[PDB]
Amino acid sequence: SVPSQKTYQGSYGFRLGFLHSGTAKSVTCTYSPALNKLFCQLAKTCPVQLWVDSTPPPGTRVRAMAIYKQSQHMTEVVRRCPHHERCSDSDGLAPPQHLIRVEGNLRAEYLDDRNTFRHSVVVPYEPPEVGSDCTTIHYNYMCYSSCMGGMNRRPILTIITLEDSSGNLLGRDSFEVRVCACPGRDRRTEEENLR
Ligand SMILES: [Zn+2]
DSSP states (O other), X not given: OOOOOOOBOTTTTOEEEOOOOOOOTTOSEEEETTTTEEEEOTTOOEEEEEEOSSOOOTTOEXXXXXXXXXXXXXXXXXXXXXXXXXXOOOOSSSOTTOSEEESSXXXXXXXXXXXXXXXXXXXXXXXXXXXXXXXXXXXXXXXXXXXXXXXXXXXXXXXXXXXXXXXXXXXXXXXXXXXXXXXXXXXXXXXXXXX
């Protein structure tokens, strides 16, 4: 099977937000609204905002999962390549096989679905703090899109779901991701090719 990727704001008006980082050759993470695509460097911080019209119940959680964008690859579990899964770079919480990690959150949980075998990382949803209108989760992608034996140049989508305490769906959003050496240049290139 394959996880749904249908955008769903739900009862709480859930949707994602991205910073405006620009396309300088030195940028480490940049988002393209026109392509609904995040371009980022390997293992660098990717700030992702969570926006809601009303605060969901305590116990609400936020899960991140990657799936291949191409239908012919959709059933394949997105995982780190044979090289990176063995480079001993775990932060002591993320299993070395997981592509997506959450930075600086000791309550982050990493799941290996006993049924689908898919990987995901989930954290408790925290309402915005004083002075803020949104909540930010810092994600890391641990393989390049080009890693052989892994993503292998195949594009992926990250699906973010707002879930209740039982894991039931409250909201969903998604975006394409390309992990590369020069996000600024690749974003500029792809947006141009779009024109
Ligand atoms: Zn890799």
